[PDB]
Amino acid sequence: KTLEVWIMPNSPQPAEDFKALVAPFEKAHGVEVKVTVLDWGVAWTKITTAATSGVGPDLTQLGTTAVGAISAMGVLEPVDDVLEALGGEKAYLPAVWRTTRLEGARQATAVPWFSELRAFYYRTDALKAAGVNPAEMFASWQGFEAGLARLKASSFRDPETKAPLAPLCTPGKNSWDVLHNAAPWIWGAGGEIVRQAGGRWQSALNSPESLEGLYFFLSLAQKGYVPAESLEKNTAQIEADFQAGKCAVFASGPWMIQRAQVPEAKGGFAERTAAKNLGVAPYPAGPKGRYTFFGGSNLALFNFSKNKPLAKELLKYLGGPEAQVRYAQMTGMLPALRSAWSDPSFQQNPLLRTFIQAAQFGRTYPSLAGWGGVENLAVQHLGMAWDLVAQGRLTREALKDLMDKASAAINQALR
Ligand SMILES: O=S([O-])[O-]
Ligand SMILES: O=S([O-])[O-]
Ligand SMILES: [Cl-]
Ligand SMILES: [Cl-]
């Protein structure tokens, strides 16, 4: 008669939004869904305890990069049946399909719920003033850097700040998404964070391709295109700087589009020049291709659940077309179910349609049991690289030294 579901704070009123989302399910099945909101401050420790103790909810949200770790503990129920009901492998972007299982596992243990992806917002007024065309600027890395150089040389001033814009704003090391900000550049160069050989995983952060991508990105902040102050800040703070009219180009997710429609008084930026002059482009095509970072969250069923049939019916509901569109809107994310990308909620909005175009270039990390150690050691060393950038002292040699140190530590952790 009750299901217990743990979620993270994905929407502006996390428990109210989720309860509204599931109310039709509760009526149809005659059950009550009891939702607990795990603040991002405590979510991972609460989930880990549940997994280690065998005490916890029926379903939990999992970030896509946590699926391998929790699956490897052997505490998750298989959900092949739910995914086949939703259309199988072909119903999902392959990057999203990768997140349904521990890498190499025969069975699915997570149901895709919603996708985070990143694309560049830009100031359509600033690019027009600079004589930069977005089609050309985001067609290649060379065009990207050439567009920032035009934006740096431009005399354009924001009509409210009365100041020139930073060509590019990005966090450096002081953000939750350090690796995710770097990943499209690693991938575009032809690199990857880890590689498999003999079924054993090792770091590839020190490969020649990975180093080219990392240097291309980090060095933009050494060339005058990113303000030093940006490197102190997290993504949320850089989003505020863009809203305030201080940045011509910056990467974020689809939630900024809804923020642009909402008054400043209610936490949005509708009144600001940036909201009235807003563009989106995908990450620019690199040497070996165009990639869009995918993250977001899935749902999993603990094998100590007393209510596995009803929990699987809720997975099918949350994973399915109607709830996919409703919850994508609530969270400012993209549906995990790829069919939902053609819904008018995305297609009627030009900026959301650009996110849909970016989405087909999606790529994610391998679903490793040891992923958190990989990311943590990657980000420590990328941090030290960002510290050299802030001093104008990041050389190609210094970057290679730091990624060799990271690779040695990663390979030890993976063994
Ligand atoms: O380059 S503009 O025409 O998209
Ligand atoms: O590419 S060098 O100018 O950092
Ligand atoms: Cl992928
Ligand atoms: Cl990778």
Q: How far is CA 87 from the centre of its chain?
A: 24
Q: How far is the CA of 299 from the centre of ligand 4 (A)?
A: 22
> Helix 141-153 and helix 208-220: axis angle, to 10°?
10
The C-alpha atoms of residue 218 and residue 291 are separated, in whole angstroms, by: 17
Each domain of the chain, given as residue ranges in start order, spans: 1-118+293-367, 119-292+368-415
Nearest by Cα to 300 from 105, 115, 101, 117:
101
The C-alpha atoms of residue 211 and residue 217 are separated, in whole angstroms, by: 10
Ligand 1 atom with the smallest distance to the CA of 135 is 1
Q: Letter for the amino acid at 146?
A: A
Q: Which ligand is nearest to the CA of 394?
A: 2
Residue with CA closest to ligand 1 atom 4? 135
> Helix 371-391 and helix 208-220: axis angle, to 10°?
50
- In the numeric block, which tokens belong to residue 334? 């993209």
What DSSP character marks residue 319? T
Q: Letter for the amino acid at 144?
A: F
Question: What is the secondary structure of 156-211 as a DSSP string?
Answer: ---TTT-SPPEEEE---SSSTTHHHHHHHHHHHTT--SEEEETTEEEE-TTSHHHH
Burial 130-150 (b: 16+ CB within 10 A, else e): bebebeebbbbbebbbebbbb
* 252 contacts: CB under 8 Å, gap ≥ 6: 118, 119, 121, 235, 238, 239, 242
Burial 58-80 (b: 16+ CB within 10 A, else e): bbbbbbbbbbbbbbbeebbbbbe
Backbone angles phi, psi at 247, to 5 degrees: -135, 130
Ligand 1 atom with the smallest distance to the CA of 133 is 1
The C-alpha atoms of residue 74 and residue 51 are separated, in whole angstroms, by: 9
Q: Given in angstroms, what resolution was this structure solved at?
A: 1.6
> Quick one: which H or E segment has residue 327?
helix 321-331
> Quick one: which H or E segment has residue 294?
strand 292-301
Question: What is the secondary structure of 89-133 as a DSSP string?
Answer: GGGS-HHHHHTTSSTT-SS---EEEEEEE-EEEEEHHHHHHHT--
- HSE, CB side, 13 Å, CA atoms: give it for residue 135: 0
* Three-state DSSP class for residue 369: coil
Our mutation pick for probing the ligand 1 site, out of 125, 133, 137, 150, counting the most ligand atoms within 8 A of Cβ, is 133
Nearest by Cα to 355 from 275, 251, 280, 274:
280
- In the numeric block, which tokens belong to residue 186? 């690693």
CB 35 within 8 A of CB 26: no
Q: Letter for the amino acid at 40?
A: W
What DSSP character marks residue 355? H
The C-alpha atoms of residue 168 and residue 137 are separated, in whole angstroms, by: 13
* 345 contacts: CB under 8 Å, gap ≥ 6: 325, 328, 329, 352
Q: How far is the CA of 116 from the centre of ligand 3 (A)?
A: 14
* 322 contacts: CB under 8 Å, gap ≥ 6: none
Give the residues across from 300 on adjacent strands.
60
Ligand 1 atom with the smallest distance to the CA of 134 is 1
Identify the residues whose C-beta falls under 6 Å from ligand 1.
Answer: 133-135
Q: Which residues neighbour ligand 4 (ion) by CB within 5 Å?
A: 192-193, 365
How many other CB atoms are there within 10 angstroms of residue 332's CB atom? 20
How many other CB atoms are there within 10 angstroms of residue 322's CB atom? 12
- In the numeric block, which tokens belong to residue 275? 């909201």
* Three-state DSSP class for residue 289: coil
Give the residue carrying structure tokens 């009235």. Answer: 276
Nearest by Cα to 367 from 58, 74, 1, 97:
97
How far are the Cα atoms of 204, 303, 330, 374 from residue 169, in angstroms, in the given order?
Answer: 27, 44, 27, 26
